[PDB]
Write a protein that binds this ligand. Structure first.
Ligand SMILES: CC(=O)N[C@H]1[C@H]([C@H](O)[C@H](O)CO)O[C@](O)(C(=O)O)C[C@@H]1O
Length: 310
């Protein structure tokens, strides 16, 4: 309580994100000798992730989560992180962020322009598509009222596969599915579990369309008033928590399809060839809109070997 800090998130109390944030908070409290306590504010209590990023910038929130892709709000070429099917796996997401000129520059800009320090990166799952009717092929997407987050890349996923997107905040999704205001949504398996979307969706299709990472971010305004030994406690704990976070997601992606089947969900495996082909005009539009910086980011990312960590 020398430093009463706050960590906001969209994810709820049953999520991997929350579990990993709990680990982070406990380690920081212990290794700071009680000087720092981090309280958690889940379920978008503080607003969504766009709002919480603004709060880090202003200094009114100390920690939050964001995807690398979310920075497309400020640097359009950063949409590359969530162009469907472009990033192959988490290894590529890691090397894109830390081992390309594009990624390194993004991290610097987040510090300089946006008032946030990137502490660590974790895996947050690969997005899949749930619905109230089976998705056996891309044909079943046509006219599907697909909820998406308020993010351009997810809206484009829905548009280009032929669905009818309805954007809304994460907090609103359960009701929309339950009432069939929409016919489906798309999120990684762990979120379908955490939010209990399986209670209100009979089908899950392995569309494998967007790879989510997760950044542990701190407000520069907060981090500057921690003496360096406490900065180190916070950084080391964020790195430890990110490895745990990733493991929770990796382990669940092995186990969760059976969990859902046990809950009465039918799992489909549509041919993804047409899904990937449908994105080609979107990639062209991305390059048009974002120009040389976008074409460069895409080339840098496509060059990455998806085999091997680092
Ligand atoms: C860090 C964070 O808040 N991630 C959230 C993401 C991103 O907001 C979105 O992918 C755009 O970047 O949206 C969800 O998946 C969603 O609303 O379905 C909830 C998830 O908790």
């Amino acid at each position: 309580a020398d430093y009463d800090l706050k960590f906001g998130m969209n994810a709820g109390t049953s999520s991997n994100e929350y579990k990993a944030a709990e680990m982070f908070a406990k380690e920081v409290k212990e290794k700071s000798q009680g000087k720092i306590e981090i309280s958690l504010y889940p379920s978008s209590q503080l607003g969504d992730d766009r709002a919480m990023l603004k709060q880090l910038k202003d200094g009114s929130l100390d920690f939050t989560f964001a995807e690398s892709a979310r920075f497309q709000l400020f640097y359009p070429e950063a949409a590359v992180f969530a162009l469907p099917y472009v990033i192959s796996n988490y290894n590529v997401a890691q090397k894109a962020l830390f081992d390309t000129e594009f990624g390194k520059d993004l991290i610097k800009k987040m510090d300089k322009d946006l008032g946030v320090t990137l502490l660590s990166q974790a895996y947050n799952g690969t997005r899949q598509t749930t619905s109230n009717r089976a998705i056996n092929s891309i044909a079943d997407m046509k006219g599907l009222k697909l909820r998406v987050p308020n993010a351009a890349t997810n809206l484009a996923y829905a548009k280009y596969v032929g669905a009818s997107p309805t954007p809304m905040a994460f907090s609103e999704v359960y009701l929309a599915l339950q009432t069939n205001a929409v016919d489906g949504q798309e999120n990684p398996l762990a979120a379908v579990q955490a939010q209990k979307f399986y209670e209100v969706q009979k089908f899950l299709a392995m569309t494998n369309h967007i790879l989510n990472d997760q950044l542990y971010l701190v407000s520069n305004e907060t981090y500057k008033e921690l003496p360096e030994d406490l900065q180190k406690v916070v950084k080391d704990a964020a790195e430890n928590a990110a490895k745990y976070h990733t493991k929770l997601f990796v382990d669940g992606e092995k186990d969760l399809v059976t969990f859902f089947e046990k809950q009465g969900v039918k799992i489909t495996h549509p041919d993804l060839v047409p899904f990937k082909e449908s994105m080609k005009p979107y990639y062209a539009e991305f390059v048009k809109q974002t120009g040389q910086k976008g074409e460069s980011a895409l080339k840098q990312i496509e060059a990455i070997n998806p085999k091997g960590e680092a």
